Amino acid sequence: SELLVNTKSGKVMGTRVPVLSSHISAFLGIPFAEPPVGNMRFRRPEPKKPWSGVWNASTYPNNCQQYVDEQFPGFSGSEMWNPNREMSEDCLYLNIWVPSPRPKSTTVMVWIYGGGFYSGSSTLDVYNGKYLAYTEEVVLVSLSYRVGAFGFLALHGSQEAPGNVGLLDQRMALQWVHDNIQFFGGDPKTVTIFGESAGGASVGMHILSPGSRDLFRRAILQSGSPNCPWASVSVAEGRRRAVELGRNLNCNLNSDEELIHCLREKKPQELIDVEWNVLPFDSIFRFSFVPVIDGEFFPTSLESMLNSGNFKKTQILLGVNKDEGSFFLLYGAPGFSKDSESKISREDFMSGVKLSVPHANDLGLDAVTLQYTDWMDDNNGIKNRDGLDDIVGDHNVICPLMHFVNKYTKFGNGTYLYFFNHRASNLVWPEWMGVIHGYEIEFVFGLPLVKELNYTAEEEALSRRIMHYWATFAKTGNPNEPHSQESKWPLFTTKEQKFIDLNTEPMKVHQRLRVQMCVFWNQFLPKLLNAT
Amino acid sequence: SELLVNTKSGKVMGTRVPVLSSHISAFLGIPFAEPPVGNMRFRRPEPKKPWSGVWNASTYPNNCQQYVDEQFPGFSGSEMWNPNREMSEDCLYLNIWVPSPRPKSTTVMVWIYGGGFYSGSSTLDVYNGKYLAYTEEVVLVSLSYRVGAFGFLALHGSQEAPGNVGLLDQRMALQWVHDNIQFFGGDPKTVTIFGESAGGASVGMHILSPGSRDLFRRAILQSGSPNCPWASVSVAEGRRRAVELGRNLNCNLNSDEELIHCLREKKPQELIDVEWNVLPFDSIFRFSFVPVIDGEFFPTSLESMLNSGNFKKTQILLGVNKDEGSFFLLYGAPGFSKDSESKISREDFMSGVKLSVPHANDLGLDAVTLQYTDWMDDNNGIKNRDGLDDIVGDHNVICPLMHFVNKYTKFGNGTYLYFFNHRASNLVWPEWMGVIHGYEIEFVFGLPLVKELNYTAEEEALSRRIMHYWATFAKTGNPNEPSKWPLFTTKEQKFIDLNTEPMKVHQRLRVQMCVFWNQFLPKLLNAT
Ligand SMILES: *[C@@H]1O[C@H](CO)[C@@H](O)[C@H](O)[C@H]1NC(C)=O
Ligand SMILES: *[C@@H]1O[C@H](CO)[C@@H](O)[C@H](O)[C@H]1NC(C)=O
Ligand SMILES: *[C@@H]1O[C@H](CO)[C@@H](O)[C@H](O)[C@H]1NC(C)=O
Numbered sequence A: 001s002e003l004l005v006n007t008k009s010g011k012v013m014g015t016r017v018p019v020l021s022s023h024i025s026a027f028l029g030i031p032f033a034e035p036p037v038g039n040m041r042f043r044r045p046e047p048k049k050p051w052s053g054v055w056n057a058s059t060y061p062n063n064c065q066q067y068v069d070e071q072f073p074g075f076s077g078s079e080m081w082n083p084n085r086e087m088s089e090d091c092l093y094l095n096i097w098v099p100s101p102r103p104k105s106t107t108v109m110v111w112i113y114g115g116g117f118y119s120g121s122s123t124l125d126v127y128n129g130k131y132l133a134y135t136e137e138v139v140l141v142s143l144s145y146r147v148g149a150f151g152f153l154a155l156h157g158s159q160e161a162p163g164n165v166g167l168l169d170q171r172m173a174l175q176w177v178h179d180n181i182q183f184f185g186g187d188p189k190t191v192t193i194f195g196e197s198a199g200g201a202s203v204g205m206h207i208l209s210p211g212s213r214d215l216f217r218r219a220i221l222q223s224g225s226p227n228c229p230w231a232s233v234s235v236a237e238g239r240r241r242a243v244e245l246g247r248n249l250n251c252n253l254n255s256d257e258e259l260i261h262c263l264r265e266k267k268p269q270e271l272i273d274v275e276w277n278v279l280p281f282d283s284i285f286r287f288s289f290v291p292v293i294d295g296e297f298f299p300t301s302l303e304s305m306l307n308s309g310n311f312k313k314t315q316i317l318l319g320v321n322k323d324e325g326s327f328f329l330l331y332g333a334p335g336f337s338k339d340s341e342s343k344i345s346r347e348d349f350m351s352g353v354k355l356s357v358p359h360a361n362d363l364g365l366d367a368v369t370l371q372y373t374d375w376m377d378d379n380n381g382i383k384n385r386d387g388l389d390d391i392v393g394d395h396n397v398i399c400p401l402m403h404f405v406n407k408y409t410k411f412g413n414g415t416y417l418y419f420f421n422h423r424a425s426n427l428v429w430p431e432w433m434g435v436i437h438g439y440e441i442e443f444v445f446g447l448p449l450v451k452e453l454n455y456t457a458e459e460e461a462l463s464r465r466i467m468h469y470w471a472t473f474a475k476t477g478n479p480n481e482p483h484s485q486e487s488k489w490p491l492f493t494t495k496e497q498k499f500i501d502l503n504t505e506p507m508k509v510h511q512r513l514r515v516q517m518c519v520f521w522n523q524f525l526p527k528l529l530n531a532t
Numbered sequence B: 001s002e003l004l005v006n007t008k009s010g011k012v013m014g015t016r017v018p019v020l021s022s023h024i025s026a027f028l029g030i031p032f033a034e035p036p037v038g039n040m041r042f043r044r045p046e047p048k049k050p051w052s053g054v055w056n057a058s059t060y061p062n063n064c065q066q067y068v069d070e071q072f073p074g075f076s077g078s079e080m081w082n083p084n085r086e087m088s089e090d091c092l093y094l095n096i097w098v099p100s101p102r103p104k105s106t107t108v109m110v111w112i113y114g115g116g117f118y119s120g121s122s123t124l125d126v127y128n129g130k131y132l133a134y135t136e137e138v139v140l141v142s143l144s145y146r147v148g149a150f151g152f153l154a155l156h157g158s159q160e161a162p163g164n165v166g167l168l169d170q171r172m173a174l175q176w177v178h179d180n181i182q183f184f185g186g187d188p189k190t191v192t193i194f195g196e197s198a199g200g201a202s203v204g205m206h207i208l209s210p211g212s213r214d215l216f217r218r219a220i221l222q223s224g225s226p227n228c229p230w231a232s233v234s235v236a237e238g239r240r241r242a243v244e245l246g247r248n249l250n251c252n253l254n255s256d257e258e259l260i261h262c263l264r265e266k267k268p269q270e271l272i273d274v275e276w277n278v279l280p281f282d283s284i285f286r287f288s289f290v291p292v293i294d295g296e297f298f299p300t301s302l303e304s305m306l307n308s309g310n311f312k313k314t315q316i317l318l319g320v321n322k323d324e325g326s327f328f329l330l331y332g333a334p335g336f337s338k339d340s341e342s343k344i345s346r347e348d349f350m351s352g353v354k355l356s357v358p359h360a361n362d363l364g365l366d367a368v369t370l371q372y373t374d375w376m377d378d379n380n381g382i383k384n385r386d387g388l389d390d391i392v393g394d395h396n397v398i399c400p401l402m403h404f405v406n407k408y409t410k411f412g413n414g415t416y417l418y419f420f421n422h423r424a425s426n427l428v429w430p431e432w433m434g435v436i437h438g439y440e441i442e443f444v445f446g447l448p449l450v451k452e453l454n455y456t457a458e459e460e461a462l463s464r465r466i467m468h469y470w471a472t473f474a475k476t477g478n479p480n481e482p483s484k485w486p487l488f489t490t491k492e493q494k495f496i497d498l499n500t501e502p503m504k505v506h507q508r509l510r511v512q513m514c515v516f517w518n519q520f521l522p523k524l525l526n527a528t
């Protein structure tokens, strides 16, 4: 029976799912950990203990407890990212799509959803893995992990809420793939982990953590890297925020045991309701509970590890989208609106920069402002909007990633960099937002291949080439098929630093993705803020 | 006689000079002060005591003692700025050009040579005032003033070497024009002072100083302003350099009088030989003995005076040239040469900025570097050369001048700004240097009008419209006679290009870079 598979933890029964006139096997909602509920909250995950009988894996699992975006009720553009299943702390499950007939020992790709480490689900429609698994004939896994306080509350020293448990949930799912994927036709020796945003930062964190390294072969990072300013905090900041969450709930702060005990007595939604109150400053692209540099999951500072080459050395394929910052400006910066061209006055521009770089001193602010202001036309509402868009995206995504690619490449065994700049013809968001953070995902999962979604013929072709690039990279460590005819995606080298645009037009090779601004963000600004 | 004039100090006999197939009156080397020699060295100037008989004013006077540029012997490009006659401490004289027949109460223009306060002469060929005086019919006066230690050694507190005597010499010459120009047909109530580089900074300083305000009507500043970083120093820095000058010459440093008496015994060239050793850093566009903010000639700091509006309120006309920095890079920065394109390597670029902003810390240097480096092509030699060229010019001339123009305009009564970007066709310097610092002067003085100089017809026309803009401005406060040179206003901040093509109006001259040099860097250096 193609649909009946017995794993190290027990039997599982999948379901036959239709896909583009054909069919594939799907194993949805398989548990990989014990429900981190009750006294398990904030605690490191524990392996799912063996069960008897056949586990029904024909339906999606619950999504983890998280903040839900209600800015635009009914609007598909935002709701497509909200939980589409009931939320529950009992959410540590994974989904698998296996080609039919079952391959023998084929390439495996594991998906790690993003969502700022405070949200995300493995069950969104945009993550349906049937199209990719079917078209590229790979075994596609979709994992999950605790987000927000439930997954990253950090009180260093304690073993009840040590921090990074969300990252540990991911590792456990990878350990599960390593031990049972062979039973689904996949080769545990050829697994590629890929994710976007927080998922992309996660992938890079596994590349760094000695405890995750041997659990995968290669890695793909989309609009996210481990060194992003929003992707981690110091143990001190983590404790400070943890204590602040308690204070917000009138918790006994006399000790970690009592604080944790108090927080374990609260209902999920109670934690979530005050989640954003613990942040240091008014800001955008900043999240309360994220990974912490604990000295355990992460031996030393991320930077020192990148400089010494202390990390998995393999091949990586990463990149960013043209307008990474717009999504976040729309939600937290004045002057921005979904139903308007959002021309930003000078007053709001100033406010935006303060909001975008919350940790900067007045001098740092002036520096950012001067670096992104055309003083021959400072009141230009459009230049001010786009300026802010670039500030947010360069600071939070692009430059941190460029820093990462340059450091990694000095020790790695293969780097391929991309710049996704295609505005989908059917985008529901306003034109000013451009190529939005997260909108390359639908192309990666082949949504353009389904006719009723109304993508253009050229968008279907773009999707097919991106999927083939991803899959081929997963299988061999090179997105290009040797001795093939199509244009070749060149390797990123420390000297030439090449990268390609990713759109519907013929390939174009560029060099030094946004070096000017990134030199500012990665070299000059830090030195300025470090002075006094 | 048309050539015999009785001044309040005595009679002077001029000389009839030829000019563009015609003639005009010339009075050369008229003494306006007592020879500041011997015990008068470093001391404020004293008015020239009356003389009997007729003073021979038919030939140029001596040039003040100064460092002489011997970098390119025989090369006319560097030599045209060197003293063209005997140097002597007895050099306080002035020259006048009067149109023939002698006009009545006509407009006067007083020229103040530049030279970084360490050099310059009123006798240079390019300062020949006959062309401008004749063509525009104005009485043209060129004055002189002590430069170097002789004119600016500052030992605040002492009255033997109080500092700023060079500026005081300029003042006495203006005071002399105020009392005697009418006798040459000049109108003392309509006097315009104009100068280039250090000459422009001087003009600016007179606009600021109370004791100078009533000695002129309007002002013109060419490639120089009072607030330039090389134009002045604190009393503390002036004293330090003064003491260090003595040290270099093994002087008794126990007290001011002992220090001064020692320095007064040395021969001129002994002082000049060690002049540069007193600078605090290795650098370019930096000079040893310059004006001092003494609380006397300058009531308070230049900036505070500019904010409170404490200065002469009138009409000003000022501008800069496209490539102000090339000249100084050629002389003190590695990688530059007069006989090559001078592509600057990356290492030399680094060295260059350090030399350009000697006072900046490492963060400041990184800031200047990032601000002027295209990181998509950092190893481009031409881009590094031009970048260094803009750094030196933006920091030392253009931006300090824009800061001055914006501050002045708030209280002034009329501002006219220009951007001179014409590359002379017969220029002897290499092309990489572009529109060099000081090369608009030949156009202001009508040199293109003389055939033998081989300028193009378009350049002659350019020179004529420039002389007319200058002269018309001097006589009415507006370079336009009733394409119009728009007025620079706080709001629109307009300015015009000055070249051989039809006039073009622009706004916010190099505002991007100047925002960096006038607001961000200062703030960054004060914070770190
Ligand atoms: C598994 O669940 C699906 C969906 O609820 C259902 O159709 C199927 O019959 C179930 N299988 C069994 C026998 O539990
Ligand atoms: C990757 O490693 C292999 C084996 O050491 C080496 O032969 C190859 O050149 C490397 N490739 C790259 C792009 O570094
Ligand atoms: C003035 O001096 C010049 C040159 O020394 C001489 O030619 C001239 O005759 C003198 N003036 C007169 C006429 O006495």
Ligand SMILES: *[C@@H]1O[C@H](CO)[C@@H](O)[C@H](O)[C@H]1NC(C)=O
Pocket (backbone or CB within 6 Å): B412, B413, B414
């Ligand atoms: C100059 O002053 C006069 C009289 O005070 C005034 O009418 C005129 O507007 C002023 N000009 C400018 C442009 O400031």
Ligand SMILES: *[C@](C)(O)CCC[N+](C)(C)C
Pocket (backbone or CB within 6 Å): A081, A114, A115, A116, A117, A196, A197, A198, A199, A437, A438
């Ligand atoms: C990233 C910070 O994890 C943000 C991800 C956001 N969505 C909307 C693309 C899921």
Ligand SMILES: *[C@](C)(O)CCC[N+](C)(C)C
Pocket (backbone or CB within 6 Å): B081, B114, B115, B116, B117, B120, B196, B197, B198, B199, B437, B438
């Ligand atoms: C200014 C610093 O006074 C420099 C002027 C230099 N010349 C060569 C034009 C006289």
Ligand SMILES: C[C@H](O)CCC[N+](C)(C)C
Pocket (backbone or CB within 6 Å): A069, A276, A285, A328, A331
């Ligand atoms: C990115 C994002 O929507 C932030 C969450 C919104 N607040 C802070 C208003 C709850």
Ligand SMILES: C[C@H](O)CCC[N+](C)(C)C
Pocket (backbone or CB within 6 Å): B069, B276, B327, B328, B331
């Ligand atoms: C441009 C100029 O003559 C600079 C002065 C040269 N040194 C420093 C050698 C005396």
Ligand SMILES: [Cl-]
Pocket (backbone or CB within 6 Å): A402, A403, A406, A515, A518, A519, A522
């Ligand atoms: Cl970088």
Ligand SMILES: [Cl-]
Pocket (backbone or CB within 6 Å): B018, B019, B020, B450
């Ligand atoms: Cl002649």
Ligand SMILES: [Cl-]
Pocket (backbone or CB within 6 Å): B083, B084, B085, B086
């Ligand atoms: Cl001689």
Ligand SMILES: [Cl-]
Pocket (backbone or CB within 6 Å): B409, B488, B489, B490, B491
């Ligand atoms: Cl105004």
